[PDB]
Design an enzyme around this catalytic site. Sequence first.
Site, short mmCIF file in Angstrom:
data_model
loop_
_atom_site.label_atom_id
_atom_site.label_comp_id
_atom_site.label_asym_id
_atom_site.label_seq_id
_atom_site.Cartn_x
_atom_site.Cartn_y
_atom_site.Cartn_z
N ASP A 17 35.34 -85.36 32.80
CA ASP A 17 34.12 -84.66 33.17
C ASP A 17 34.25 -84.00 34.52
O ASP A 17 34.09 -84.67 35.55
CB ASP A 17 32.94 -85.65 33.20
CG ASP A 17 31.62 -84.99 33.57
OD1 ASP A 17 31.55 -83.74 33.57
OD2 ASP A 17 30.64 -85.74 33.83
N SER A 60 30.72 -66.00 38.37
CA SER A 60 31.14 -65.05 37.36
C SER A 60 30.68 -63.66 37.73
O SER A 60 29.61 -63.48 38.30
CB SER A 60 30.60 -65.46 35.99
OG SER A 60 30.89 -64.46 35.02
#
Length: 330
Positions: free
Chosen positions: A35, A199
Amino acid sequence: STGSATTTPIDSLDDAYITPVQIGTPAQTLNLDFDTGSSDLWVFSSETTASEVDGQTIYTPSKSTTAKLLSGATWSISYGDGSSSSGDVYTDTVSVGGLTVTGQAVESAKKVSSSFTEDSTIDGLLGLAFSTLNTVSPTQQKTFFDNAKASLDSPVFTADLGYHAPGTYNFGFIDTTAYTGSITYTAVSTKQGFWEWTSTGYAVGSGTFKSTSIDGIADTGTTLLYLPATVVSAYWAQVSGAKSSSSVGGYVFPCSATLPSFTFGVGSARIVIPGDYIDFGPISTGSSSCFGGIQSSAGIGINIFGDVALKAAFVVFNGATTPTLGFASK
Protein backbone atom coordinates in the site's frame (compact mmCIF):
# COMPACT_ATOMS: atom_id res chain seq x y z
CA SER A 1 20.71 -5.84 -2.72
CA THR A 2 17.45 -6.24 -4.60
CA GLY A 3 14.13 -8.03 -4.24
CA SER A 4 11.44 -9.12 -6.68
CA ALA A 5 8.03 -10.52 -5.80
CA THR A 6 4.93 -11.38 -7.78
CA THR A 7 1.75 -9.55 -6.88
CA THR A 8 -1.59 -11.17 -7.64
CA PRO A 9 -5.14 -9.78 -7.84
CA ILE A 10 -7.34 -11.08 -4.98
CA ASP A 11 -10.40 -11.54 -7.19
CA SER A 12 -11.71 -11.27 -10.73
CA LEU A 13 -12.20 -7.49 -10.44
CA ASP A 14 -8.66 -6.61 -9.30
CA ASP A 15 -10.14 -5.21 -6.08
CA ALA A 16 -6.66 -5.39 -4.55
CA TYR A 17 -3.35 -7.18 -4.95
CA ILE A 18 -1.51 -9.52 -2.59
CA THR A 19 2.20 -10.16 -2.42
CA PRO A 20 3.84 -12.95 -0.40
CA VAL A 21 6.00 -11.80 2.52
CA GLN A 22 8.23 -13.89 4.79
CA ILE A 23 8.11 -12.90 8.47
CA GLY A 24 10.10 -14.40 11.31
CA THR A 25 12.36 -17.40 11.85
CA PRO A 26 11.46 -19.96 10.56
CA ALA A 27 9.64 -17.98 7.87
CA GLN A 28 5.93 -17.41 8.21
CA THR A 29 4.61 -16.46 4.79
CA LEU A 30 1.69 -14.04 4.75
CA ASN A 31 0.01 -12.44 1.74
CA LEU A 32 0.07 -8.71 2.26
CA ASP A 33 -1.54 -5.78 0.49
CA PHE A 34 1.35 -3.49 -0.58
CA ASP A 35 0.00 0.00 0.00
CA THR A 36 1.84 3.09 -1.22
CA GLY A 37 -0.86 5.13 0.54
CA SER A 38 0.00 4.13 4.12
CA SER A 39 3.07 3.39 6.20
CA ASP A 40 2.25 0.58 8.67
CA LEU A 41 3.23 -3.06 8.14
CA TRP A 42 0.52 -4.86 10.07
CA VAL A 43 -0.60 -8.47 10.14
CA PHE A 44 -3.35 -10.74 11.28
CA SER A 45 -1.83 -12.62 14.19
CA SER A 46 -2.23 -15.07 17.03
CA GLU A 47 -3.28 -12.02 19.06
CA THR A 48 -6.19 -11.06 16.80
CA THR A 49 -9.64 -11.34 18.34
CA ALA A 50 -10.70 -14.82 17.25
CA SER A 51 -14.16 -13.77 16.03
CA GLU A 52 -12.42 -11.25 13.75
CA VAL A 53 -10.33 -13.87 11.95
CA ASP A 54 -12.06 -15.68 9.10
CA GLY A 55 -9.64 -17.54 6.85
CA GLN A 56 -6.56 -15.31 7.02
CA THR A 57 -3.09 -16.67 7.64
CA ILE A 58 -1.79 -15.37 10.97
CA TYR A 59 1.62 -14.37 12.24
CA THR A 60 2.46 -16.13 15.51
CA PRO A 61 5.34 -14.21 17.08
CA SER A 62 5.88 -16.79 19.84
CA LYS A 63 6.94 -19.25 17.10
CA SER A 64 9.57 -16.87 15.73
CA THR A 65 13.01 -17.04 17.33
CA THR A 66 13.81 -13.56 16.02
CA ALA A 67 10.58 -11.87 17.20
CA LYS A 68 11.02 -9.32 19.98
CA LEU A 69 8.16 -7.43 21.61
CA LEU A 70 8.62 -3.69 21.28
CA SER A 71 7.96 -2.64 24.84
CA GLY A 72 5.00 -0.35 25.33
CA ALA A 73 4.40 0.20 21.62
CA THR A 74 0.91 0.22 20.13
CA TRP A 75 -0.63 1.17 16.81
CA SER A 76 -4.01 2.12 15.46
CA ILE A 77 -4.87 3.11 11.92
CA SER A 78 -7.99 4.15 10.02
CA TYR A 79 -8.13 4.12 6.26
CA GLY A 80 -9.89 6.30 3.71
CA ASP A 81 -12.49 3.59 3.08
CA GLY A 82 -13.49 3.61 6.75
CA SER A 83 -11.70 0.38 7.68
CA SER A 84 -9.38 0.15 10.70
CA SER A 85 -7.10 -2.01 12.80
CA SER A 86 -4.95 -1.79 15.93
CA GLY A 87 -2.69 -3.79 18.22
CA ASP A 88 0.87 -4.08 19.53
CA VAL A 89 4.27 -4.28 17.90
CA TYR A 90 7.10 -6.73 17.42
CA THR A 91 10.36 -6.35 15.57
CA ASP A 92 11.28 -9.32 13.39
CA THR A 93 12.98 -10.33 10.19
CA VAL A 94 10.96 -9.53 7.07
CA SER A 95 11.82 -10.59 3.51
CA VAL A 96 10.18 -9.67 0.21
CA GLY A 97 11.19 -11.45 -2.96
CA GLY A 98 14.70 -12.24 -1.69
CA LEU A 99 15.25 -8.87 0.04
CA THR A 100 15.68 -9.10 3.82
CA VAL A 101 15.29 -6.49 6.55
CA THR A 102 16.17 -7.36 10.14
CA GLY A 103 14.48 -5.45 12.94
CA GLN A 104 11.41 -4.54 10.93
CA ALA A 105 8.45 -3.32 12.95
CA VAL A 106 5.71 -5.89 12.47
CA GLU A 107 2.47 -4.53 13.83
CA SER A 108 0.38 -7.35 15.28
CA ALA A 109 -3.36 -6.84 15.12
CA LYS A 110 -5.48 -7.32 18.23
CA LYS A 111 -8.53 -5.79 16.51
CA VAL A 112 -9.53 -5.45 12.85
CA SER A 113 -12.69 -3.92 11.38
CA SER A 114 -15.30 -6.01 9.59
CA SER A 115 -14.07 -5.38 6.04
CA PHE A 116 -10.69 -6.90 6.90
CA THR A 117 -12.30 -9.90 8.60
CA GLU A 118 -14.52 -10.38 5.54
CA ASP A 119 -11.57 -10.49 3.17
CA SER A 120 -9.94 -13.87 3.77
CA THR A 121 -7.34 -13.25 1.06
CA ILE A 122 -5.55 -10.31 2.73
CA ASP A 123 -3.38 -11.24 5.70
CA GLY A 124 -2.30 -7.66 6.42
CA LEU A 125 -0.82 -4.55 4.83
CA LEU A 126 2.72 -3.50 3.96
CA GLY A 127 2.90 0.27 3.85
CA LEU A 128 5.13 2.00 1.30
CA ALA A 129 4.25 5.68 1.80
CA PHE A 130 6.56 7.86 3.87
CA SER A 131 7.43 6.85 7.42
CA THR A 132 6.07 10.13 8.80
CA LEU A 133 2.60 8.54 8.51
CA ASN A 134 3.48 5.49 10.61
CA THR A 135 1.05 5.17 13.52
CA VAL A 136 3.21 3.37 16.09
CA SER A 137 3.19 5.09 19.46
CA PRO A 138 5.02 6.36 21.41
CA THR A 139 7.95 5.73 19.06
CA GLN A 140 7.14 5.96 15.35
CA GLN A 141 8.57 3.14 13.22
CA LYS A 142 10.02 2.99 9.70
CA THR A 143 8.57 1.29 6.62
CA PHE A 144 10.08 -1.80 5.03
CA PHE A 145 11.33 0.33 2.15
CA ASP A 146 12.80 2.94 4.49
CA ASN A 147 14.67 0.23 6.39
CA ALA A 148 15.91 -1.47 3.20
CA LYS A 149 16.82 1.67 1.29
CA ALA A 150 20.48 2.09 2.13
CA SER A 151 21.19 -1.55 1.27
CA LEU A 152 19.46 -1.38 -2.12
CA ASP A 153 21.46 -1.15 -5.34
CA SER A 154 19.30 1.90 -6.11
CA PRO A 155 16.90 3.57 -3.61
CA VAL A 156 13.76 2.70 -5.57
CA PHE A 157 10.90 0.29 -5.77
CA THR A 158 8.60 -0.27 -8.73
CA ALA A 159 4.96 -1.29 -9.07
CA ASP A 160 3.93 -3.25 -12.15
CA LEU A 161 0.32 -4.24 -11.46
CA GLY A 162 -1.49 -6.50 -13.86
CA TYR A 163 -4.96 -6.19 -15.39
CA HIS A 164 -6.67 -9.48 -14.47
CA ALA A 165 -3.19 -10.96 -14.24
CA PRO A 166 -0.15 -11.22 -11.99
CA GLY A 167 2.40 -8.42 -11.82
CA THR A 168 5.53 -7.51 -9.94
CA TYR A 169 6.94 -5.40 -7.12
CA ASN A 170 10.70 -4.87 -7.50
CA PHE A 171 13.00 -3.32 -4.90
CA GLY A 172 16.35 -1.76 -5.68
CA PHE A 173 16.38 -1.89 -9.49
CA ILE A 174 14.43 -0.88 -12.58
CA ASP A 175 13.63 -3.75 -14.94
CA THR A 176 14.14 -2.11 -18.32
CA THR A 177 12.36 -5.03 -20.03
CA ALA A 178 9.11 -4.34 -18.12
CA TYR A 179 8.02 -1.22 -19.98
CA THR A 180 7.89 0.36 -23.41
CA GLY A 181 9.33 3.70 -24.44
CA SER A 182 10.86 5.83 -21.69
CA ILE A 183 10.09 6.49 -18.04
CA THR A 184 8.88 10.05 -17.45
CA TYR A 185 9.72 11.38 -14.02
CA THR A 186 7.64 13.94 -12.21
CA ALA A 187 8.00 15.86 -8.92
CA VAL A 188 6.72 14.55 -5.59
CA SER A 189 5.58 16.40 -2.50
CA THR A 190 6.05 14.48 0.73
CA LYS A 191 4.26 17.17 2.76
CA GLN A 192 1.25 14.93 3.47
CA GLY A 193 3.28 11.74 3.78
CA PHE A 194 2.13 10.45 0.38
CA TRP A 195 3.63 9.89 -3.04
CA GLU A 196 1.87 13.10 -4.10
CA TRP A 197 2.32 14.46 -7.62
CA THR A 198 0.63 16.62 -10.24
CA SER A 199 -0.80 15.17 -13.42
CA THR A 200 -0.70 17.49 -16.40
CA GLY A 201 -4.23 16.66 -17.62
CA TYR A 202 -6.50 14.12 -19.23
CA ALA A 203 -8.40 12.89 -22.26
CA VAL A 204 -11.52 10.75 -22.63
CA GLY A 205 -11.42 8.13 -25.37
CA SER A 206 -10.18 9.62 -28.62
CA GLY A 207 -10.98 13.13 -27.37
CA THR A 208 -8.57 16.04 -27.27
CA PHE A 209 -6.24 16.32 -24.31
CA LYS A 210 -7.19 18.85 -21.63
CA SER A 211 -4.18 20.51 -20.07
CA THR A 212 -4.97 20.99 -16.40
CA SER A 213 -3.11 20.34 -13.15
CA ILE A 214 -4.48 17.48 -11.09
CA ASP A 215 -2.76 17.01 -7.75
CA GLY A 216 -3.15 13.48 -6.39
CA ILE A 217 -1.41 10.48 -4.84
CA ALA A 218 -0.05 7.28 -6.33
CA ASP A 219 -1.83 4.75 -4.12
CA THR A 220 -1.54 1.02 -4.78
CA GLY A 221 -3.84 0.38 -1.82
CA THR A 222 -6.82 2.10 -3.41
CA THR A 223 -8.73 0.16 -6.05
CA LEU A 224 -10.24 2.93 -8.13
CA LEU A 225 -9.26 6.21 -9.79
CA TYR A 226 -10.67 9.18 -7.84
CA LEU A 227 -10.56 12.49 -9.69
CA PRO A 228 -12.28 15.90 -9.57
CA ALA A 229 -16.01 15.96 -10.24
CA THR A 230 -15.56 17.99 -13.46
CA VAL A 231 -13.21 15.35 -14.90
CA VAL A 232 -15.32 12.41 -13.84
CA SER A 233 -18.46 14.03 -15.25
CA ALA A 234 -16.70 14.55 -18.59
CA TYR A 235 -15.70 10.86 -18.66
CA TRP A 236 -19.09 9.33 -17.85
CA ALA A 237 -20.85 11.72 -20.22
CA GLN A 238 -19.31 9.61 -23.01
CA VAL A 239 -21.05 6.47 -21.76
CA SER A 240 -24.67 6.05 -22.80
CA GLY A 241 -26.89 5.50 -19.79
CA ALA A 242 -24.22 6.27 -17.19
CA LYS A 243 -25.35 8.14 -14.12
CA SER A 244 -24.22 9.06 -10.63
CA SER A 245 -26.19 7.02 -8.11
CA SER A 246 -26.32 8.19 -4.49
CA SER A 247 -27.86 4.88 -3.41
CA VAL A 248 -25.07 2.84 -4.97
CA GLY A 249 -22.41 5.40 -4.04
CA GLY A 250 -20.98 6.52 -7.34
CA TYR A 251 -21.20 6.35 -11.09
CA VAL A 252 -22.87 3.29 -12.54
CA PHE A 253 -23.35 2.35 -16.17
CA PRO A 254 -25.18 -0.28 -18.24
CA CYS A 255 -23.18 -3.48 -18.25
CA SER A 256 -23.75 -3.74 -22.02
CA ALA A 257 -21.73 -0.56 -22.62
CA THR A 258 -18.29 -0.38 -24.20
CA LEU A 259 -16.28 2.01 -22.05
CA PRO A 260 -13.96 4.64 -23.54
CA SER A 261 -10.35 4.77 -22.47
CA PHE A 262 -9.03 7.43 -20.10
CA THR A 263 -5.70 9.14 -20.59
CA PHE A 264 -3.76 10.99 -17.91
CA GLY A 265 -0.72 13.18 -18.35
CA VAL A 266 2.65 12.73 -16.75
CA GLY A 267 4.60 15.76 -17.86
CA SER A 268 4.48 15.69 -21.65
CA ALA A 269 3.88 11.93 -21.60
CA ARG A 270 0.54 10.13 -21.61
CA ILE A 271 -0.70 6.97 -19.88
CA VAL A 272 -3.74 5.32 -21.49
CA ILE A 273 -6.15 3.38 -19.27
CA PRO A 274 -8.12 1.00 -21.51
CA GLY A 275 -11.87 1.19 -21.11
CA ASP A 276 -12.07 -2.39 -19.83
CA TYR A 277 -9.97 -1.38 -16.81
CA ILE A 278 -12.77 0.94 -15.72
CA ASP A 279 -15.44 -1.83 -15.53
CA PHE A 280 -15.94 -3.14 -11.98
CA GLY A 281 -18.88 -5.31 -12.84
CA PRO A 282 -22.43 -5.67 -11.58
CA ILE A 283 -23.38 -3.55 -8.58
CA SER A 284 -24.95 -6.67 -7.09
CA THR A 285 -24.99 -10.25 -8.25
CA GLY A 286 -27.14 -10.61 -11.35
CA SER A 287 -27.60 -6.87 -11.95
CA SER A 288 -27.23 -5.31 -15.39
CA SER A 289 -26.03 -2.09 -13.74
CA CYS A 290 -22.24 -2.00 -13.45
CA PHE A 291 -19.97 0.00 -11.16
CA GLY A 292 -17.53 2.51 -12.60
CA GLY A 293 -13.80 2.48 -11.99
CA ILE A 294 -13.46 6.27 -12.20
CA GLN A 295 -15.21 8.10 -9.38
CA SER A 296 -15.37 11.59 -7.92
CA SER A 297 -12.90 12.64 -5.26
CA ALA A 298 -15.24 15.39 -4.07
CA GLY A 299 -15.46 14.98 -0.32
CA ILE A 300 -12.46 12.65 -0.18
CA GLY A 301 -10.35 15.77 -0.04
CA ILE A 302 -7.67 14.35 -2.31
CA ASN A 303 -7.38 12.85 -5.80
CA ILE A 304 -6.22 9.22 -5.84
CA PHE A 305 -4.42 7.50 -8.66
CA GLY A 306 -5.34 4.02 -7.46
CA ASP A 307 -4.93 0.65 -9.10
CA VAL A 308 -7.17 1.49 -12.09
CA ALA A 309 -4.58 4.10 -13.11
CA LEU A 310 -1.39 2.53 -11.84
CA LYS A 311 -1.98 -0.87 -13.47
CA ALA A 312 -1.93 0.88 -16.87
CA ALA A 313 1.69 1.85 -16.14
CA PHE A 314 5.09 0.78 -14.95
CA VAL A 315 5.57 2.99 -11.90
CA VAL A 316 8.85 3.96 -10.28
CA PHE A 317 8.77 5.08 -6.68
CA ASN A 318 12.10 6.86 -6.43
CA GLY A 319 13.25 7.25 -2.81
CA ALA A 320 16.31 9.34 -3.58
CA THR A 321 17.08 12.26 -1.23
CA THR A 322 14.54 14.20 -3.28
CA PRO A 323 11.85 11.63 -4.08
CA THR A 324 10.24 11.50 -7.52
CA LEU A 325 7.74 9.33 -9.40
CA GLY A 326 8.30 7.74 -12.77
CA PHE A 327 5.64 6.47 -15.18
CA ALA A 328 6.09 4.41 -18.32
CA SER A 329 3.67 2.71 -20.66
CA LYS A 330 3.92 -1.05 -20.89
